Structures are given as C-alpha cells and as structure tokens.
Amino acid sequence: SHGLFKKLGIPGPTPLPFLGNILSYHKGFCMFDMECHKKYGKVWGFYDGQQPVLAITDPDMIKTVLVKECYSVFTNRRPFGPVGFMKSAISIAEDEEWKRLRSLLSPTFTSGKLKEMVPIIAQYGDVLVRNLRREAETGKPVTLKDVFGAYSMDVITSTSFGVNIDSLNNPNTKKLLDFLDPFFLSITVFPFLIPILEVLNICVFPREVTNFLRKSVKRMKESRLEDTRVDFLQLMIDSQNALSDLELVAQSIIFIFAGYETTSSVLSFIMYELATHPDVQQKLQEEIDAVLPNKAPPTYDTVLQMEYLDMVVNETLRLFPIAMRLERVCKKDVEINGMFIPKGVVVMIPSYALHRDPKYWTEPEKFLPERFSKKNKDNIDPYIYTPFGSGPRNCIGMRFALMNMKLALIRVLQNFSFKPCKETQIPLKLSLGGLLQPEKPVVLKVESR
Ligand code: HEM
Numbered sequence: 001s002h003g004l005f006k007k008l009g010i011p012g013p014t015p016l017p018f019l020g021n022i023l024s025y026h027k028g029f030c031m032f033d034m035e036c037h038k039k040y041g042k043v044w045g046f047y048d049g050q051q052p053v054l055a056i057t058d059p060d061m062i063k064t065v066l067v068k069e070c071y072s073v074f075t076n077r078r079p080f081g082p083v084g085f086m087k088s089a090i091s092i093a094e095d096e097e098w099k100r101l102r103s104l105l106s107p108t109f110t111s112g113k114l115k116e117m118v119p120i121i122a123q124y125g126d127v128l129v130r131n132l133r134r135e136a137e138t139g140k141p142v143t144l145k146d147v148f149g150a151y152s153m154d155v156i157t158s159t160s161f162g163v164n165i166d167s168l169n170n171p172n173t174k175k176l177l178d179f180l181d182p183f184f185l186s187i188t189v190f191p192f193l194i195p196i197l198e199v200l201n202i203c204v205f206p207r208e209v210t211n212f213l214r215k216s217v218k219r220m221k222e223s224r225l226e227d228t229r230v231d232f233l234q235l236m237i238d239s240q241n242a243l244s245d246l247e248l249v250a251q252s253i254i255f256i257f258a259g260y261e262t263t264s265s266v267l268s269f270i271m272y273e274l275a276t277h278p279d280v281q282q283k284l285q286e287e288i289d290a291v292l293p294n295k296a297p298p299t300y301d302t303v304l305q306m307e308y309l310d311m312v313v314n315e316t317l318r319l320f321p322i323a324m325r326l327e328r329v330c331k332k333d334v335e336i337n338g339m340f341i342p343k344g345v346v347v348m349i350p351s352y353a354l355h356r357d358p359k360y361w362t363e364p365e366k367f368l369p370e371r372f373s374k375k376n377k378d379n380i381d382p383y384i385y386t387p388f389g390s391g392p393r394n395c396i397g398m399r400f401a402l403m404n405m406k407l408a409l410i411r412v413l414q415n416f417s418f419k420p421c422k423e424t425q426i427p428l429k430l431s432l433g434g435l436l437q438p439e440k441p442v443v444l445k446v447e448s449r
C-alpha cells in the first residue's frame, strides 16, 4: 500500500507504518505542502495514514482534473469522515446525487437574485456601522471576527430564507466542526473506523448544533408553507412538489456555515491587511468616495465599478485562501498529461502553496494589491490562483461572497479607519488546523472618520 509512489516512481516523504506521513502535519499542512513543493518539485505523493494522496502543481494537469475530466473521472471530494444525514449536503455528495443538487441549487446565485439581495443586506450595513460606531467610544482594542461574524449570520439568514433574526442586536455554528485532538487524527489517519460511527450515530458536528438547526430550519420552513420571492429556501420547495426533507436541511446547514464562517474570516484578514497597510487602506477609502459621493449607499453596479476593492479582496485571498487545498478522488484508472494515476488515489491541489510559489509571483509573502491591476491581471494563471476552485465543482457561493464582503467593506470604510493596537498580532500567524484561521483573533482599533 505504501509501495504505491515508489512503484509509480513518484517522489515523496517516506511513510511510517500506520501513520503514513501524518506526523509531518505537526507544524501545519500549509508548511508541509510548501516544504514538499520545494523539496520534490512539480508532483509528489504522501499518505494520510493508508491513503495515497498525489499532489500536482502543473497548471495544465490541474485544468484537466479540475475542468476536463471532472464528470468522468474526478467528480468527488475525499470520503471525509462521519457525516450522518449531512451525506446529502452538496459539498459532500457524490456522483449523480451531486449533479442533481448542483443544477437544483445553482440558480440560487444568478444576477437577478443577487441584485435582489442588495436591498436586503442594505439594512445590515446600517446595523454593522452602528455597532462599530458604539465600539469606537471605549477606544480600546477590538475583535473583528466577533463583530463581522454577526454580520455574516444576519445576511445569510435574511437572503437564503428571508428570515431576519437580528443577530446584530443579540450579543452553535462556530461550535460546529481538532487536528491535535485525537479525533480527526484518529480518522484522517484512520478511515476504517468511519462505517462504525455511522452506526454509532456519532457526528463531526455535535448532536446539539444540528438539532438546533434542525428544528430551526424546520421553523423558517413552516412559515412559508401557507402565507402568500424565488429564493434559496423557496427554490427547494419547488423540488419537493426530486428533493426531500433532510436533504433540504442538509443544504441549508452548509450554506449557513459557508456564508457565516468563511465570509467573516476573510473579512478579518482584509481589515488586518488594510491596517498594517494604511496607504492601501486610504487608496480604497478614496475609490469608495470617488464612486459613491457623500457616504452614499453601495449598490450592485457601483460594487462592480470598484476595481481597487476587487484588487484588495483578490490579493488578500492570494495570501489567505481559506481552503488550503482542493481535492478530487480519482474514480477509475486514468492517464492525464503524461502521468498514470490509479483508481482510488486522492489528487490534491495545494492552493496555499501555489499562491506562494517563487515561480509565479515576485515577492510572494508581501501584500501587493497591484499584482491584480488590469495591467498585470493577465500574467496570472487561473490554475495557479484558485481561491474558489475551478470547473464544475467550484465554489457555488463565489459571486455572493465577493459582493457580500464588498458591501460589508464599502460601508465600513465609508465610515471608519483601522489601525493596529498593542493586542494586534504583527505579523500574523496561522493556526495549524484544517481551514485558515489566525492563531489569535484579529484585533484592531477603529477611528470615526
Ligand atoms: C470568501 C469566502 C469563500 C471562499 C474563499 C470559498 C472557497 C471555496 C472553495 C475553494 C471551494 C471548493 C471548490 C473546489 O474544490 O473546486 C468551495 C466549494 C463550495 N462552496 Fe465556497 N467559498 C466561499 C464562500 C461560500 C459561500 C458564501 C457559499 C454559499 C453560501 C459557498 C458554498 C460552497 C459549496 C456548496 C461548495 C461545494 C461545491 C460543490 O461541490 O458543488 N462557499 N468554496
């Protein structure tokens, strides 16, 4: 089993019995991945316990697996762990079930819908400003994640279900999904357990989170079913009259999670950058003022007008792609771009690493929004820079997240400035676990303008 990459003649760190190359995750697997890239070059193999994982870095090879051979050979992400009813969630579902869930849910994020979520969020901008304006008094540090997390929550519920639960006025989901903890280490390493827990009804999500979201999303549901907008919660009612009940809740939980957790983490990273780069912060405050004269209310079209904003957002995502790695399980023997990949292998694209490769980026540790200007934008390979994945299985929420973040940014910057305080971590360190987090909360002071 551990003979695979020696047999295919693919380079790699030497696996230990049982553990595989697991111990190398000790100092976080963005580092492991960087090390590997440097040490082995363009393609390598390692073992999550007994699982062979082939890393590929060739822009062409990546396009083939992400785009060309998706439907046929590379359709599914890793077999994750013990999901429960979340088996149905779109990001977890495989093969046919996924295709069906995809075109069922993909119309959720069209122009018209998006355009129709600009006024809905437009009330949450007004409550985010107000929250911060109150927090500008004390003049002490601040936790961006906490104030930003509640914004995300509010936007997600109100659009996807059209349910205002006014989170911004009420100070589960963060307790949802540990590497050091024997847990994922006993599964990421050891998968043979999984079918057991599926009978034990044990879940990667605590029973109490999903039970809440269960009866809660069952409640946002009831209200609709009698009283007489074509939205997310509405779209899934369409299919029920070939969708089902727990399949409806499943999609909801992923969406609530995605929209809450990622949106706020990214927004924290951007603010961190704008403080630690005030010139960039000013240039943006300028653009915002140029497009929106007089602290005016952002809009769908005025949002797309802002080039430098988009450049800022893109460059944060170069440094801090919250996914680390894209993955695709190889479901039949295959030969892509002159390389043989056997059925069963997990093909891995090390996004964080390629986003930092001395090859495609000069000065790759530095935050340089300009590397994204219309002048330079075309020298950038859509297959080295993939914060949203690519091909059919790419991020369905991309356009919502970008607009939502930007709406959060426009309004916040047309009202406030951001500066490091003494409880700001300069520079920033990543925590070692799964998705990209800062090892200490991002904390910054906030002047009124
Ligand atoms: C800045 C915030 C976000 C980032 C950086 C982001 C990034 C990604 C990435 C890299 C993937 C995998 C694509 C692939 O493997 O090719 C992904 C998948 C997905 N994302 Fe997004 N995402 C973000 C926000 C969202 C939002 C707001 C939603 C919807 C509410 C969303 C829903 C999904 C779903 C359902 C999948 C799995 C797609 C499928 O298999 O059909 N994520 N996300």
Ligand SMILES: CC[C@H](C)C(=O)N[C@H](CC[C@H](Cc1ccccc1)NC(=O)OCc1cncs1)Cc1ccccc1
Pocket (backbone or CB within 6 Å): 077, 078, 080, 081, 091, 176, 177, 253, 254, 257, 258, 262, 323, 325, 327, 395, 397
């Ligand atoms: C490598 C094994 C690891 C356990 C794994 O497969 N998970 C990651 C992380 C996936 C987690 C899974 C999850 C956590 C908590 C609740 C539900 C599911 N994140 C996830 O699917 O979030 C939805 C998102 C969409 N866009 C960004 S996050 C792979 C992945 C899937 C989808 C998008 C990006 C990366």
